[PDB]
Amino acid sequence: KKKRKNPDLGFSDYAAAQLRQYHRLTKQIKPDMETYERLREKHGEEFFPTSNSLLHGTHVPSTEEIDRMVIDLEKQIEKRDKYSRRRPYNDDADIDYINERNAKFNKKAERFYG
RNA sequence: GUGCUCGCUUCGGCAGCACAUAUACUAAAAUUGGAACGAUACAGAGAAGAUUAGCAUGGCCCCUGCGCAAGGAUGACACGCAAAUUCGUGAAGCGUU
Ligand SMILES: [Mg+2]
Ligand SMILES: [Mg+2]
Ligand SMILES: [Mg+2]
Ligand SMILES: [Mg+2]
């Protein structure tokens, strides 16, 4: 059995959050060594190109593949859509604001003047 | 067309020589399209409770002026989610290995 934890911190740079998300997505993927070997026995030495070494024009993908990336796109898009968790419209406390822009400005002022 | 051939050669012509060397958006048209700040009618003036001065910024907006001056309502126009890359706790319940 296995165990780990990862706590959230400051967004410090957009890079940090991006990196966390990449970690998760990367861990998810599971590759088929079948297709890997199939692709391998055709091309051989072309498999291991340096930045500058080797070249074959284009690798054309079966559509079924393309569907995988499209699906992952939609998933990540949703997960990103949920970035900001909204606090429910609570009327219970005292109202001094005149509109929602004013309500939010009063909230930002509450953070900076204690 | 002009003159001269000592040309025929009459005074008729013809010839020869010289001299002279290329205009033009071809149109009296026929077209074809857009404006007059004119009517017509609507329309109808920044800021802050009210009444009002203005100087700017921006640009597929101009107008009067010789203008790099000045003026034109401060010349006009310039506001409904002006939301952008990207999350995670704490508890509970349910179903699963
Ligand atoms: Mg006023
Ligand atoms: Mg002016
Ligand atoms: Mg005035
Ligand atoms: Mg102005």
From Swiss-Prot:
**Which tissues and organs express this gene's product?**
Abundantly expressed in the heart, skeletal muscle and kidney. Expressed at lower level other tissues.
Q: Which UniProt keywords apply?
A: Acetylation, Coiled coil, Isopeptide bond, mRNA processing, mRNA splicing, Nucleus, Spliceosome, Ubl conjugation
Q: Where in the cell is it found?
A: Nucleus
Per the entry, what this protein does is: Involved in pre-mRNA splicing as component of the spliceosome.
Task: Give the multimer and partner information.
Answer: Identified in the spliceosome C complex. Interacts with CCNDBP1.
Similarity annotation: Belongs to the SYF2 family.
Which protein are we looking at? Pre-mRNA-splicing factor SYF2
Gene expressing this chain:
SYF2
